């Protein structure tokens with residue numbers, strides 16, 4: 001009975017006790033997110049309290065096994081996850097206050113309505129009503145109305161809540177021996193016991209800033225190219241040297257520029273590489289989308305979805321009999337219960353999101369047999385990357401023609417090729433400055449670097465400088481625009497989508513090399529390749545049992561995040577854009593403003 | 597004079613696997629073919645014989661062990677297996693001749709909120725020898741510091757609850773198990789096929 005052996009047994013106890021408490025918290029959350037009510041808020045709060053009190057008792061015991069006397073790597077990793085006491089290091093009042101704040105923000109976010117001014121009772125939710133305006137409208141004033149109403153009438157409700165959330169979350173983080181909540185979040189990437197594979201929380205910030213420097217030129221030129229195109233889409237409204245107005249970017253925040261494809265398509269006379277129209281003509285519904293994503297995975301040697309996944313998931317809007325949070329989420333409840341929550345519409349966007357969310361489930365299924373504490377992505381960027389690897393293949397014209405969403409005599413040109421890359425960039429390259437800047441703002445707020453009466457000042461400064469984007473209306477410190485986005489008001493880390501976006505290409509490189517793919521990385525579709533399926537799975541099945549730096553090296557040969565594979569995926573488009581822009585302004589002045 | 601298999605296979609309540617029930621069967625006719633087809637069993641595996649072959653056979657006694665476990669654990673009710681159930685709860689011998697039968701009991705043995713009445717033994721200081729049954733409640737001492745009948749540090753109560761919720765995946769759902777041993781002693785065969 002060495003210490004290691006005593007810890008092994010203790011964890012044996014833990015895994016078995018933990019499984020039910022966690023599952024009951026998951027179920028309680030599921031009811032709330034599918035059916036928002038005070039009764040379901042109370043049950044969620046009760047199940048989460050049980051879970052947290054269980055975790056607290058368990059962690060204080062785990063810390064009675066000194067890690068210094070522990071050689072088993074995977075044992076050491078489990079006791080490392082119980083090294084901090086978690087969310088229960090807050091008083092009962094503060095903890096109940098924090099939950100109130102979290103529930104209120106999430107409820108406000110998926111329940112708040114703005115009413116039309118011409119019709120004082122034709123009300124619209126963010127999803128679908130406002131999102132539809134922000135994805136399809138070509139009217140400056142309609143888009144300005146939806147963008148401003150959301151932030152004015154809902155984001156203002158969130159402002160004082162967010163303030164106290166920061167205070168409370170930082171105390172939680174300080175009590176867990178971090179500097180602030182933002183440092184706490186960055187710990188997801190920390191690696192400690194392993195020599196030549198360590199990674200500190202400070203190296204993340206450095207690696208993100210350093211890596212972002214190499215993405216700027218691609219982004220500068222994509223920026224300049226859409227901005228010239230928007231000039232004709234909104235006569236009078238676009239400065240040739242200014243930032244883009246934030247309400248014209250194709251969704252509520254410009255987090256993705258995908259919906260600008262119809263305005264920026266480089267070669268419009270060619271077959272439509274945007275299969276949204278094609279899948280409405282063929283009567284596709286949500287089920288067809290998800291059964292097609294399932295066909296894609298078993299094509300590479302991975303499993304069907306479970307029967308419980310099909311019987312218990314919510315794959316479409318329930319109607320107005322329930323108030324649900326429609327933001328696509330992949331749920332691993334425990335005990336082999338896997339669900340997706342999604343309000344699926346018949347759109348290429350939702351087609352690809354279906355593959356990506358299923359990808360995360362596929363990950364969850366592959367490490368279900370790992371011990372509870374290691375049932376997780378190697379890091380948050382891994383976990384958000386798997387799905388996107390899949391959609392890189394599922395989005396290619398080759399793949400789209402094979403599932404019958406392009407003509408069977410569709411022909412690939414150097415022009416259809418550029419159309420595709422352009423659309424891919426709108427999504428993938430567009431989101432990077434958006435993603436970096438949002439987290440930098442949150443990191444700065446958590447670090448105490450922005451006085452509260454400067455929050456919205458610095459937010460829009462950072463938008464103008466890093467992102468090339470400018471508010472169409474001046475915003476007071478009564479506003480809380482960061483919170484008008486799901487992840488900010490639902491308390492999720494955001495840099496995952498940055499690191500995730502670099503990983504996904506590093507991985508695609510390795511998967512395509514496995515599948516023997518021939519030419520450039522953007523023509524690759526791993527469908528039907530079990531050798532690719534297998535290489536992916538052997539990383540999925542590991543969960544967090546290996547530090548992410550080694551898990552990454554095992555698949556791609558690098559112990560660190562790397563921007564070169566993404567840059568090279570886009571090289572053809574980069575050289576094109578630079579030619580396209582030879583007569584346009586490139587770069588942006590931050591002084592111009594839509595309003596004067 | 598047919599054998600009371602119903603009493604066993606169709607009982608409303610089943611034992612926990614740590615305290616598995618054994619029913620002695622004797623002086624009766626047993627149609628093992630009608631059993632194989634009397635329902636859809638997820639598992640019906642015979643080891644020293646076959647079902648059609650058993651209606652040709654006579655035995656002194658038949659023993660029917662029954663209990664509930666997780667699906668992902670039914671693979672342990674077989675000779676030569678290891679793991680929590682085979683090691684600490686129910687051990688078939690290596691030379692086992694007899695049948696293992698199991699079916700999904702999610703609809704009888706799950707409950708919203710969860711049914712926790714079924715237990716399994718989590719810890720033991722050594723392995724059950726075949727067909728032993730351990731209903732002891734002594735604290736398991738994970739070290740040399742003695743427990744003295746109370747839970748605590750390195751001191752664990754050895755029996756734990758399954759949690760059966762109707763939404764669990766198949767591996768986590770309850771399965772009902774029946775194990776049939778066939779005893780031949782130097783005495784009259786009293787249980788035969790037709």
Ligand SMILES: *[C@@H]1O[C@H](CO)[C@@H](O)[C@H](O)[C@H]1NC(C)=O
Nearest residue numbers: 035036037038039040321322
């Ligand atoms: C929604 O929640 C309430 C309790 O808060 C419950 O009574 C109702 O049946 C639920 N509706 C659905 C569709 O689950």
Ligand SMILES: *[C@@H]1O[C@H](CO)[C@@H](O)[C@H](O)[C@H]1NC(C)=O
Nearest residue numbers: 056057060063083084085089
């Ligand atoms: C929680 O963590 C702190 C700091 O490690 C520790 O001092 C304390 O004893 C732990 N348990 C409880 C109930 O606070």
Ligand SMILES: *[C@@H]1O[C@H](CO)[C@@H](O)[C@H](O)[C@H]1NC(C)=O
Nearest residue numbers: 008070071072073074075076
């Ligand atoms: C780690 O521990 C597990 C058992 O918990 C063992 O199977 C594995 O081989 C060990 N590896 C190392 C490096 O300790």
Ligand SMILES: *[C@@H]1O[C@H](CO)[C@@H](O)[C@H](O)[C@H]1NC(C)=O
Nearest residue numbers: 299398399401402403527528
């Ligand atoms: C292979 O992929 C093609 C499309 O590229 C598809 O039509 C075909 O059915 C797939 N074959 C198998 C065996 O999955």
Ligand SMILES: *[C@@H]1O[C@H](CO)[C@@H](O)[C@H](O)[C@H]1NC(C)=O
Nearest residue numbers: 601602603605606631634635
């Ligand atoms: C269990 O009950 C059903 C319904 O009465 C019956 O048909 C079946 O044969 C029974 N099973 C056994 C093994 O007796």
